[PDB]
Coordinates of C-alpha atoms and ligand atoms in Angstrom, one line a residue:
Chain A
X22 CA -76.4 -22.9 49.6
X23 CA -74.7 -22.5 46.2
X24 CA -74.8 -26.1 44.4
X25 CA -71.7 -26.0 42.2
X26 CA -72.1 -29.6 41.0
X27 CA -75.4 -30.3 38.6
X28 CA -75.7 -33.6 37.7
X29 CA -78.8 -34.0 35.4
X30 CA -80.3 -36.6 32.4
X31 CA -79.6 -34.3 29.5
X32 CA -78.2 -31.1 28.3
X33 CA -81.4 -29.3 29.0
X34 CA -82.1 -30.2 32.4
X35 CA -78.4 -28.7 33.3
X36 CA -79.4 -26.2 31.2
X37 CA -82.5 -25.2 33.2
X38 CA -80.6 -26.5 36.9
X39 CA -77.4 -24.1 36.3
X40 CA -79.5 -21.1 35.4
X41 CA -82.2 -21.7 38.3
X42 CA -78.8 -22.0 40.5
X43 CA -77.3 -18.9 38.8
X44 CA -80.2 -17.0 39.4
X45 CA -81.3 -18.3 43.1
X46 CA -78.4 -19.0 44.4
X47 CA -75.5 -16.7 43.3
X48 CA -72.0 -16.9 44.8
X49 CA -70.7 -13.0 43.4
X50 CA -73.6 -10.5 41.8
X51 CA -70.3 -8.9 40.0
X52 CA -70.3 -5.4 37.5
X53 CA -68.5 -7.7 35.2
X54 CA -66.4 -6.2 31.8
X55 CA -70.3 -6.7 29.8
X56 CA -72.0 -5.6 32.5
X57 CA -74.0 -7.2 35.9
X58 CA -74.2 -10.4 36.5
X59 CA -74.8 -13.5 38.9
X60 CA -72.6 -15.7 39.1
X61 CA -71.6 -19.0 40.4
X62 CA -67.4 -19.9 40.8
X63 CA -65.9 -23.3 39.3
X64 CA -69.6 -25.0 38.6
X65 CA -69.8 -28.4 37.8
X66 CA -72.2 -30.0 35.8
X67 CA -72.7 -33.6 34.4
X68 CA -74.8 -35.1 31.6
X69 CA -75.4 -38.0 31.8
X70 CA -76.8 -38.7 27.6
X71 CA -74.7 -36.4 25.8
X72 CA -76.8 -36.9 22.6
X73 CA -79.1 -34.6 24.2
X74 CA -77.8 -32.3 22.9
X75 CA -80.7 -30.3 20.6
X76 CA -82.9 -28.4 24.1
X77 CA -86.4 -29.2 23.2
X78 CA -87.4 -26.3 24.6
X79 CA -88.7 -23.3 22.5
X80 CA -88.7 -21.5 25.2
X81 CA -85.0 -21.5 25.1
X82 CA -85.0 -19.8 21.9
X83 CA -82.2 -16.9 22.1
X84 CA -79.6 -19.6 20.4
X85 CA -82.3 -21.2 17.6
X86 CA -81.3 -24.0 16.1
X87 CA -80.6 -22.9 12.5
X88 CA -77.5 -20.6 13.8
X89 CA -75.9 -23.5 16.0
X90 CA -75.9 -26.4 12.7
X91 CA -74.1 -22.9 10.9
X92 CA -71.7 -21.8 13.4
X93 CA -71.5 -26.6 13.9
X94 CA -71.0 -26.6 10.9
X95 CA -68.1 -23.1 10.6
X96 CA -66.7 -24.9 13.0
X97 CA -65.9 -28.1 12.3
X98 CA -65.3 -27.2 8.7
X99 CA -62.1 -25.8 10.2
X100 CA -63.0 -22.1 7.9
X101 CA -62.1 -18.3 8.7
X102 CA -64.7 -16.9 6.1
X103 CA -66.9 -15.7 9.2
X104 CA -67.9 -13.1 7.1
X105 CA -69.5 -15.4 4.8
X106 CA -70.9 -18.3 7.1
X107 CA -73.4 -15.9 9.1
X108 CA -74.3 -13.5 6.8
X109 CA -77.8 -13.6 8.0
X110 CA -76.9 -13.0 11.5
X111 CA -75.8 -9.7 11.6
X112 CA -75.3 -9.4 15.3
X113 CA -72.4 -11.3 15.4
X114 CA -70.2 -8.9 13.2
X115 CA -68.0 -7.6 15.8
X116 CA -66.9 -11.3 16.2
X117 CA -66.2 -11.8 13.0
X118 CA -64.3 -9.1 12.0
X119 CA -60.6 -7.5 11.1
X120 CA -57.6 -7.3 13.5
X121 CA -58.2 -3.2 14.1
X122 CA -54.8 -3.2 16.0
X123 CA -51.4 -3.1 14.0
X124 CA -50.3 -4.7 17.0
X125 CA -51.5 -8.5 16.0
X126 CA -51.6 -9.4 12.5
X127 CA -55.2 -9.4 10.0
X128 CA -54.7 -13.5 9.9
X129 CA -55.2 -13.3 13.4
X130 CA -58.4 -15.1 14.1
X131 CA -59.9 -16.4 17.7
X132 CA -62.2 -19.1 15.9
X133 CA -62.8 -22.4 16.5
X134 CA -62.6 -24.3 13.7
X135 CA -59.4 -23.8 12.9
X136 CA -57.6 -24.5 16.3
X137 CA -59.6 -28.0 16.3
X138 CA -58.6 -28.4 12.8
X139 CA -54.9 -28.1 13.3
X140 CA -54.8 -30.3 16.3
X141 CA -57.6 -33.5 14.8
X142 CA -54.7 -35.2 13.7
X143 CA -52.2 -36.0 16.7
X144 CA -55.2 -35.7 19.3
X145 CA -57.6 -38.7 17.0
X146 CA -54.1 -40.4 16.7
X147 CA -53.0 -40.1 20.1
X148 CA -56.9 -41.4 21.0
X149 CA -57.1 -43.9 18.4
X150 CA -53.9 -45.4 18.9
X151 CA -52.6 -45.1 23.0
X152 CA -55.3 -47.3 24.7
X153 CA -56.9 -45.2 28.1
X154 CA -54.6 -42.3 27.1
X155 CA -55.3 -39.6 29.8
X156 CA -53.6 -36.6 26.7
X157 CA -56.7 -36.1 24.1
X158 CA -56.8 -32.4 24.9
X159 CA -58.5 -30.3 22.5
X160 CA -56.9 -26.4 23.2
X161 CA -58.9 -23.5 22.8
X162 CA -57.9 -20.4 24.7
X163 CA -54.5 -20.1 23.7
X164 CA -51.9 -18.2 25.6
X165 CA -51.3 -15.7 22.2
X166 CA -54.8 -15.0 22.6
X167 CA -53.6 -12.6 25.8
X168 CA -52.3 -9.8 23.4
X169 CA -56.5 -9.2 23.2
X170 CA -55.8 -8.8 26.9
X171 CA -55.0 -4.6 26.6
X172 CA -56.7 -4.1 23.4
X173 CA -59.7 -2.4 21.9
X174 CA -61.4 -5.5 20.1
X175 CA -64.4 -6.8 19.7
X176 CA -62.8 -10.4 19.5
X177 CA -64.0 -13.3 20.5
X178 CA -60.7 -14.0 23.7
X179 CA -62.1 -18.0 24.2
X180 CA -64.4 -18.7 26.4
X181 CA -63.7 -22.1 25.8
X182 CA -60.7 -23.9 27.7
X183 CA -60.2 -26.8 26.8
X184 CA -62.3 -29.6 25.9
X185 CA -60.8 -33.6 26.9
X186 CA -61.3 -36.7 25.1
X187 CA -60.9 -40.3 26.4
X188 CA -62.0 -43.7 26.0
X189 CA -62.4 -46.5 28.5
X190 CA -64.1 -49.7 28.5
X191 CA -65.7 -48.7 24.5
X192 CA -67.3 -45.0 25.4
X193 CA -66.3 -41.6 24.9
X194 CA -66.2 -39.3 27.3
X195 CA -65.8 -35.8 27.2
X196 CA -64.3 -33.4 29.7
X197 CA -65.1 -29.3 28.4
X198 CA -63.3 -27.2 30.5
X199 CA -64.5 -23.5 30.2
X200 CA -62.7 -20.2 31.3
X201 CA -66.4 -17.6 31.0
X202 CA -69.6 -19.0 30.2
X203 CA -73.1 -17.3 29.8
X204 CA -75.5 -19.8 30.9
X205 CA -78.4 -17.9 30.4
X206 CA -77.6 -18.1 26.0
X207 CA -74.1 -19.2 24.5
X208 CA -74.5 -22.4 26.9
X209 CA -77.3 -23.6 24.6
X210 CA -74.4 -22.7 21.7
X211 CA -71.7 -24.2 23.6
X212 CA -73.7 -27.2 24.7
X213 CA -74.9 -27.8 21.1
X214 CA -71.4 -27.4 19.5
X215 CA -69.6 -29.9 22.0
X216 CA -72.5 -32.5 22.1
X217 CA -71.9 -32.2 17.7
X218 CA -67.8 -32.3 17.9
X219 CA -67.8 -35.0 20.3
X220 CA -70.2 -37.3 18.6
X221 CA -67.4 -37.1 15.3
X222 CA -64.9 -37.9 17.7
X223 CA -67.1 -40.9 19.0
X224 CA -67.8 -41.9 15.3
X225 CA -64.4 -41.0 14.0
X226 CA -62.9 -43.2 16.7
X227 CA -66.2 -46.1 16.2
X228 CA -67.3 -46.0 19.8
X229 CA -70.1 -45.2 22.2
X230 CA -70.7 -42.2 23.8
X231 CA -69.8 -42.2 27.6
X232 CA -71.3 -38.7 29.8
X233 CA -70.0 -35.1 29.2
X234 CA -68.7 -32.4 32.5
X235 CA -69.2 -28.8 31.7
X236 CA -66.5 -27.4 34.4
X237 CA -67.2 -23.0 33.9
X238 CA -64.9 -21.2 36.0
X239 CA -67.3 -18.3 36.1
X240 CA -71.2 -19.7 35.7
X241 CA -72.8 -16.5 34.6
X242 CA -76.1 -15.5 34.1
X243 CA -76.0 -11.4 33.4
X244 CA -79.5 -9.1 35.2
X245 CA -80.5 -8.1 32.0
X246 CA -81.8 -11.8 30.9
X247 CA -83.4 -12.7 33.9
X248 CA -86.7 -11.9 32.5
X249 CA -85.6 -14.4 29.9
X250 CA -84.3 -17.2 32.1
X251 CA -87.5 -16.8 34.1
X252 CA -88.9 -17.5 31.3
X253 CA -88.3 -21.1 30.6
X254 CA -87.9 -22.0 34.6
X255 CA -91.5 -24.0 34.5
Chain B
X23 CA -71.4 -44.8 44.1
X24 CA -68.8 -42.8 43.3
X25 CA -68.4 -39.1 44.6
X26 CA -66.7 -36.4 41.9
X27 CA -67.2 -33.7 43.8
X28 CA -65.0 -33.0 47.3
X29 CA -65.0 -30.2 49.4
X30 CA -62.7 -30.1 52.3
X31 CA -61.4 -27.4 55.0
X32 CA -57.5 -27.7 54.1
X33 CA -54.9 -29.3 51.1
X34 CA -54.9 -32.4 53.3
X35 CA -58.1 -33.4 54.0
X36 CA -58.6 -32.9 50.1
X37 CA -56.1 -34.8 49.3
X38 CA -56.8 -37.8 51.8
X39 CA -60.8 -37.5 50.7
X40 CA -59.7 -37.6 47.1
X41 CA -57.3 -40.6 47.1
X42 CA -59.9 -42.6 50.0
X43 CA -62.6 -42.2 47.1
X44 CA -60.1 -43.8 44.2
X45 CA -58.8 -46.3 46.1
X46 CA -62.4 -47.3 47.7
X47 CA -64.7 -46.5 44.4
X48 CA -63.5 -45.8 41.2
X49 CA -65.0 -45.5 38.6
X50 CA -63.0 -47.3 35.7
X51 CA -59.7 -49.4 36.6
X52 CA -57.8 -48.9 34.3
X53 CA -54.9 -50.3 32.5
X54 CA -52.4 -46.8 31.1
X55 CA -49.7 -45.4 29.7
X56 CA -47.6 -45.7 33.1
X57 CA -49.5 -48.8 34.3
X58 CA -52.9 -50.0 36.0
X59 CA -54.3 -47.4 38.5
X60 CA -58.1 -46.7 40.1
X61 CA -59.4 -43.6 38.4
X62 CA -62.1 -41.7 39.1
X63 CA -63.3 -39.1 35.6
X64 CA -63.5 -35.7 35.9
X65 CA -63.2 -34.9 39.7
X66 CA -63.8 -31.8 41.2
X67 CA -61.7 -31.1 44.5
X68 CA -62.6 -27.7 46.6
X69 CA -60.7 -26.3 49.1
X70 CA -61.9 -23.5 51.8
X71 CA -58.4 -22.6 53.3
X72 CA -55.6 -22.7 50.7
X73 CA -53.0 -21.7 52.9
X74 CA -52.4 -25.2 54.0
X75 CA -50.4 -26.2 51.0
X76 CA -48.1 -27.7 53.1
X77 CA -49.7 -31.1 54.5
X78 CA -48.8 -31.4 57.8
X79 CA -49.0 -35.9 57.9
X80 CA -45.9 -37.1 58.0
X81 CA -47.1 -40.5 55.9
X82 CA -47.1 -38.6 53.4
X83 CA -44.0 -38.3 52.7
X84 CA -43.6 -39.4 48.9
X85 CA -43.3 -36.4 47.9
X86 CA -40.5 -34.1 50.7
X87 CA -41.3 -30.3 51.2
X88 CA -37.2 -29.6 50.6
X89 CA -37.7 -31.7 47.1
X90 CA -41.6 -29.4 46.9
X91 CA -39.6 -26.5 48.0
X92 CA -36.6 -26.9 45.4
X93 CA -39.4 -27.0 42.6
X94 CA -41.2 -24.2 43.6
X95 CA -38.2 -21.9 43.5
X96 CA -37.4 -23.5 40.1
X97 CA -40.2 -23.1 39.3
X98 CA -40.9 -19.7 39.8
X99 CA -37.7 -18.2 39.4
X100 CA -38.5 -19.1 35.7
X101 CA -35.6 -21.6 34.3
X102 CA -34.4 -24.0 32.6
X103 CA -31.7 -24.7 34.4
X104 CA -33.8 -28.2 35.9
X105 CA -30.0 -30.0 35.9
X106 CA -28.6 -27.9 38.4
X107 CA -31.8 -27.1 40.0
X108 CA -33.1 -31.0 40.8
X109 CA -29.1 -32.0 40.8
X110 CA -29.8 -34.0 44.7
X111 CA -32.5 -35.9 42.9
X112 CA -30.8 -38.7 40.3
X113 CA -34.5 -40.3 39.9
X114 CA -36.6 -36.7 38.5
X115 CA -33.7 -37.6 34.7
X116 CA -35.3 -38.6 33.0
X117 CA -38.4 -35.5 32.8
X118 CA -35.5 -33.8 33.0
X119 CA -32.9 -34.6 30.0
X120 CA -32.9 -32.6 26.3
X121 CA -34.9 -33.2 23.8
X122 CA -33.9 -37.0 21.9
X123 CA -35.8 -36.4 19.1
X124 CA -34.4 -34.3 16.0
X125 CA -38.4 -33.2 15.0
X126 CA -38.7 -30.9 18.1
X127 CA -35.5 -28.6 18.8
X128 CA -33.2 -28.8 21.8
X129 CA -34.2 -25.9 23.9
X130 CA -37.7 -27.3 23.7
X131 CA -38.7 -28.8 27.3
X132 CA -42.3 -28.7 29.4
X133 CA -41.4 -27.2 32.1
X134 CA -44.3 -24.2 34.1
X135 CA -41.6 -22.2 35.4
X136 CA -41.3 -20.5 31.9
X137 CA -44.4 -20.6 30.7
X138 CA -46.0 -19.0 34.0
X139 CA -42.7 -16.2 33.6
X140 CA -43.5 -15.9 29.8
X141 CA -47.8 -14.6 30.3
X142 CA -47.3 -12.8 34.4
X143 CA -46.7 -9.6 32.8
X144 CA -50.1 -9.9 30.4
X145 CA -52.3 -11.7 33.5
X146 CA -50.7 -9.6 36.8
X147 CA -52.4 -6.7 34.6
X148 CA -55.8 -8.1 33.2
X149 CA -56.3 -9.3 37.3
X150 CA -55.4 -5.8 38.4
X151 CA -56.6 -3.1 36.2
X152 CA -59.7 -4.9 34.9
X153 CA -62.7 -4.8 37.2
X154 CA -63.9 -8.8 38.2
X155 CA -62.0 -9.5 35.0
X156 CA -62.9 -13.4 34.0
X157 CA -59.9 -13.9 31.5
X158 CA -57.3 -13.9 33.4
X159 CA -55.8 -17.8 32.3
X160 CA -52.6 -19.7 32.8
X161 CA -52.2 -22.3 29.8
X162 CA -49.7 -25.0 30.7
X163 CA -50.5 -27.2 28.6
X164 CA -49.8 -25.9 25.4
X165 CA -51.2 -27.4 21.3
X166 CA -47.5 -27.6 20.3
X167 CA -46.9 -30.2 23.1
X168 CA -48.7 -32.5 21.1
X169 CA -45.5 -33.3 19.2
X170 CA -45.0 -34.8 21.7
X171 CA -48.1 -37.7 21.5
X172 CA -46.2 -39.4 18.7
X173 CA -42.5 -40.0 20.4
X174 CA -40.5 -41.8 22.5
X175 CA -39.8 -38.9 24.8
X176 CA -39.9 -39.3 28.8
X177 CA -40.4 -35.5 29.2
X178 CA -43.6 -34.3 30.8
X179 CA -46.5 -34.2 28.5
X180 CA -48.2 -31.5 31.4
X181 CA -50.5 -32.9 33.2
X182 CA -51.9 -29.2 34.7
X183 CA -54.2 -28.0 31.8
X184 CA -54.9 -24.0 33.3
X185 CA -54.4 -22.3 36.0
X186 CA -57.3 -19.3 36.3
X187 CA -57.7 -16.5 38.9
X188 CA -59.6 -14.5 39.3
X189 CA -60.7 -11.9 42.1
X190 CA -64.1 -10.4 43.1
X191 CA -65.1 -8.5 46.5
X192 CA -61.1 -7.9 47.6
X193 CA -60.6 -12.3 47.1
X194 CA -58.6 -14.2 44.7
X195 CA -59.8 -17.2 43.5
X196 CA -58.5 -19.7 42.0
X197 CA -59.1 -22.7 39.4
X198 CA -56.6 -25.1 38.7
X199 CA -57.9 -27.8 36.2
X200 CA -55.4 -31.3 35.7
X201 CA -55.7 -32.9 32.2
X202 CA -54.1 -35.5 34.3
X203 CA -53.4 -36.8 38.2
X204 CA -51.3 -38.6 39.8
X205 CA -53.8 -38.3 43.3
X206 CA -51.1 -40.2 45.6
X207 CA -47.8 -39.2 44.6
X208 CA -47.5 -35.9 42.4
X209 CA -50.6 -34.5 43.5
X210 CA -48.6 -33.4 46.7
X211 CA -46.6 -31.1 44.9
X212 CA -48.8 -29.9 43.2
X213 CA -51.0 -28.6 45.8
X214 CA -47.7 -27.3 46.6
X215 CA -46.9 -25.3 43.9
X216 CA -50.7 -24.5 43.1
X217 CA -50.7 -23.3 47.2
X218 CA -47.6 -20.9 46.1
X219 CA -48.3 -19.9 42.9
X220 CA -52.2 -18.7 44.4
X221 CA -50.5 -17.0 47.3
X222 CA -48.1 -15.3 45.2
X223 CA -50.7 -14.0 42.7
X224 CA -52.6 -12.6 46.2
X225 CA -49.8 -10.9 47.2
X226 CA -48.7 -9.6 43.9
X227 CA -52.1 -7.9 43.5
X228 CA -52.7 -7.0 47.2
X229 CA -55.8 -9.3 48.2
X230 CA -56.5 -11.8 50.4
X231 CA -57.3 -14.8 49.0
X232 CA -61.1 -16.8 49.1
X233 CA -60.8 -20.8 48.1
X234 CA -58.7 -22.9 45.2
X235 CA -60.3 -25.4 42.9
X236 CA -58.7 -28.3 41.6
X237 CA -60.3 -30.0 38.8
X238 CA -59.1 -33.6 37.5
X239 CA -60.0 -35.3 34.1
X240 CA -58.6 -38.1 35.3
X241 CA -57.5 -38.1 39.2
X242 CA -55.9 -41.7 39.3
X243 CA -54.0 -44.0 42.2
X244 CA -51.8 -46.8 40.5
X245 CA -52.4 -50.2 41.9
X246 CA -48.4 -49.7 42.8
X247 CA -48.9 -47.6 45.5
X248 CA -52.0 -48.7 46.8
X249 CA -50.2 -49.8 50.2
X250 CA -48.6 -46.3 50.7
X251 CA -51.8 -44.8 49.7
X252 CA -53.6 -47.0 52.9
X253 CA -50.2 -46.0 55.0
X254 CA -51.9 -42.3 55.4
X255 CA -55.6 -42.8 55.5
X256 CA -56.4 -43.5 59.9
Ligands
FAD21 C1 -66.9 -16.7 16.1 C2 -68.5 -16.3 16.9 C3 -68.0 -15.5 18.4 C4 -68.7 -15.3 19.1 N1 -68.2 -14.8 20.5 C5 -69.4 -14.4 20.9 C6 -68.8 -14.0 22.3 O1 -67.1 -14.6 23.0 N2 -69.8 -13.5 23.5 C7 -71.2 -13.8 23.7 O2 -71.8 -13.1 23.9 N3 -71.6 -13.9 21.4 C8 -70.7 -14.3 21.5 N4 -71.1 -14.6 19.5 C9 -72.5 -14.4 19.4 C10 -73.0 -15.3 19.7 O3 -72.7 -17.1 19.1 C11 -74.9 -15.1 20.2 O4 -75.2 -14.9 18.5 C12 -74.9 -14.0 21.6 O5 -74.5 -14.5 22.3 C13 -76.3 -14.3 21.1 O6 -76.5 -12.8 22.1 P1 -78.2 -12.1 22.4 O7 -79.4 -13.1 22.0 O8 -77.7 -11.7 23.7 O9 -78.3 -12.0 20.9 P2 -77.8 -9.8 21.0 O10 -78.0 -9.7 19.3 O11 -76.7 -9.5 21.9 O12 -79.4 -9.0 21.0 C14 -80.2 -8.9 20.1 C15 -80.7 -8.1 19.0 O13 -81.6 -7.9 19.1 C16 -82.4 -6.6 19.8 N5 -82.9 -6.0 21.0 C17 -83.6 -6.9 21.5 N6 -84.7 -6.9 22.4 C18 -84.4 -5.6 22.7 C19 -84.7 -4.2 23.6 N7 -85.7 -4.9 24.4 N8 -83.9 -3.3 23.9 C20 -83.1 -3.5 22.4 N9 -82.4 -4.2 22.1 C21 -83.2 -4.9 21.8 C22 -80.2 -6.1 20.9 O14 -80.6 -5.0 20.5 C23 -79.7 -6.5 19.1 O15 -79.5 -5.9 18.2 C24 -69.8 -14.6 18.6 C25 -70.2 -15.0 17.7 C26 -69.6 -15.6 17.0 C27 -70.0 -16.1 15.0
FAD22 C1 -40.0 -30.9 35.4 C2 -40.1 -32.1 35.8 C3 -41.3 -32.2 36.0 C4 -41.2 -34.0 36.1 N1 -43.2 -34.8 35.7 C5 -43.4 -36.0 35.4 C6 -44.8 -36.5 35.9 O1 -45.4 -36.0 34.6 N2 -44.8 -37.3 35.8 C7 -44.9 -38.0 37.1 O2 -45.0 -39.3 37.0 N3 -43.9 -37.6 37.8 C8 -42.8 -36.3 37.3 N4 -42.3 -35.7 38.1 C9 -41.1 -36.4 39.1 C10 -42.3 -36.0 40.3 O3 -42.1 -34.5 40.3 C11 -42.4 -37.0 41.7 O4 -40.4 -37.0 41.9 C12 -42.2 -38.1 41.4 O5 -43.7 -38.2 41.5 C13 -41.7 -38.9 43.0 O6 -42.4 -40.6 42.7 P1 -42.3 -41.8 43.1 O7 -42.6 -41.6 44.6 O8 -42.8 -42.7 42.5 O9 -40.6 -41.7 42.6 P2 -39.7 -42.4 41.2 O10 -38.2 -42.0 42.2 O11 -40.6 -42.8 40.5 O12 -39.8 -44.4 42.6 C14 -38.7 -43.7 43.8 C15 -37.3 -44.9 43.7 O13 -37.0 -45.7 45.1 C16 -37.4 -46.7 44.3 N5 -37.8 -48.1 45.0 C17 -38.1 -47.9 46.1 N6 -38.6 -48.7 46.6 C18 -37.8 -50.1 46.1 C19 -39.0 -51.3 45.6 N7 -39.7 -51.6 46.3 N8 -38.9 -51.7 44.6 C20 -38.5 -51.7 43.1 N9 -37.7 -49.8 43.5 C21 -38.3 -49.6 44.2 C22 -37.5 -46.9 42.4 O14 -36.9 -47.8 42.1 C23 -37.0 -45.3 42.7 O15 -35.9 -45.2 42.1 C24 -41.2 -35.0 37.3 C25 -39.9 -33.9 37.5 C26 -39.9 -32.9 37.6 C27 -38.3 -31.7 37.9
DCM23 N1 -68.2 -20.0 23.6 C1 -68.1 -18.7 24.3 C2 -67.4 -17.6 24.4 C3 -68.0 -16.6 25.5 N2 -68.7 -16.0 26.3 C4 -69.7 -15.3 26.9 C5 -68.7 -16.0 28.5 C6 -68.5 -14.4 28.6 O1 -70.1 -13.8 28.6 C7 -68.4 -13.9 27.5 C8 -66.6 -13.4 27.2 O2 -66.5 -12.2 28.1 P1 -65.5 -12.4 28.5 O3 -64.0 -13.0 28.1 O4 -65.6 -10.9 29.5 O5 -65.6 -13.9 30.1 O6 -69.1 -14.4 26.2 C9 -69.2 -18.1 26.5 O7 -70.2 -17.9 27.1 N3 -70.0 -19.2 25.5
DCM24 N1 -48.0 -31.8 37.7 C1 -47.9 -33.7 37.0 C2 -47.2 -33.7 36.3 C3 -48.1 -34.9 35.9 N2 -48.9 -35.9 36.3 C4 -49.2 -37.6 36.6 C5 -50.1 -37.8 36.1 C6 -49.6 -39.3 35.0 O1 -50.0 -39.9 36.8 C7 -48.5 -39.1 34.5 C8 -48.7 -38.2 33.4 O2 -48.6 -39.9 32.4 P1 -50.3 -38.8 31.8 O3 -49.4 -37.9 30.4 O4 -49.8 -40.4 30.9 O5 -51.2 -38.7 32.1 O6 -47.8 -38.2 35.8 C9 -48.9 -35.3 38.1 O7 -49.9 -36.0 38.6 N3 -48.4 -33.7 38.2

């Protein structure tokens, strides 16, 4: 029976449990926009100890932590010079290029950083000043991104939907809602970025960290990555 | 031990199980923006049979289905004449009034309907024409709503974050992500609206319905409603 709720002590244990479940007990085996994948709809993953966002198993190597840290610095700095930030990574070129279509502006991008930066002042104020607020939600995916749907663009239509932060009894709790998660590869990056971001937020607020929840409307592993996943299970 | 994952056959069974768990095994007992409540962070609720969105127990009566249907017609019609639509319900007046602050425009509102209406053409096209798309996400809560955070407005800062639809093997699956859920009262309305909306979407696409997932970053019951909840449990 497909297990959709996964609670783990640390990010790596969650990572491995999620990938094992998608490989072994998929809800769907489906031909997607970018190839065949095993998929579980609406997975919920809980990580008890979010400081563990850098996974230790060197076999989980498709996202190097050099790349993850460069991505983090690029994202938290809120800039748009992705060509410079990622010049050492030619394979990401199709995700950082200028919009081809005249429909949306040439300054249009779907980088998370500028959106986080735009919302940080209002969201930090709420998080710091309104006790026990439920209102602190970073919007990543935007309805204005829907202009990408019927286009030939290669820009990311944001896989991350929103990140909610809330503080109870001195601890920061985090809920990252993913529209779409490549659980074998990109989730290593997403776990790193979300781990860094929540510690950034917790430090800004002067609070300690509670736990981390990761919901994924589509949690998938592409068939082309099954061997890679098997390489780090066991 | 606090149960955060609840799977139920129908909306009412989920409703009762969620409320029982918040009352009996809260994660937090917290003083919120609008009073003390029991709370469970990041609850996931699965409803197997989403046609059941009208609950049958007449003791669950704080959201009348006359009101719920009027709300539905108002929302799906995409209009902004809330004063007319809800004239028979004086108690909702503070949620439908014009913005008081000069900061945001006087046409500003947080009604779901116009936002659903704005996104329906692009999202239906994706849902109908891109096979096995993961991209169909109705954004409800918007970052532009953050202008409400440091204001004295009584308008709803959207409790509903997003609603994701996807189709696999002839069936529509729905994932409603709630930022904030009053599980005893308003969740009856939210279940009704989301049940109606997903059947609207499924009919537009000519597909049958799969199941419904409801995630809630804050799932709470106000202490002032504990007696009401106890009245419909058992
Ligand atoms: C701003 C930004 C947005 C991004 N958005 C997304 C996104 O939405 N989705 C996403 O998936 N990634 C996205 N990325 C990229 C992501 O961060 C990772 O770089 C990527 O997921 C790595 O996947 P991969 O290991 O398959 O690398 P890839 O670059 O896809 O593959 C590794 C390289 O090795 C080659 N290769 C290795 N073995 C073989 C073989 N046997 N046969 C043929 N070729 C082989 C491949 O051809 C390829 O060039 C984004 C990056 C940036 C900077
Ligand atoms: C566009 C829109 C947006 C909305 N947004 C929200 C929202 O964000 N959050 C939300 O909670 N609701 C919201 N609502 C309202 C919601 O849809 C329901 O109407 C509401 O949640 C009903 O809650 P209630 O049963 O506590 O009713 P209430 O109106 O809160 O209470 C019932 C009435 O009975 C009175 N009453 C009954 N018994 C007693 C007693 N013993 N002592 C004193 N007074 C008593 C109360 O004073 C009150 O007037 C919205 C409505 C609309 C139309
Ligand atoms: N931060 C991100 C951005 C994207 N993706 C993945 C999910 C899909 O594998 C693909 C996006 O394709 P789609 O838009 O069809 O869901 O990239 C991811 O896992 N994490
Ligand atoms: N569709 C909606 C809109 C709002 N609320 C509830 C959640 C909170 O009880 C309150 C919103 O307050 P807050 O913004 O502080 O979360 O209304 C809800 O349950 N469903």
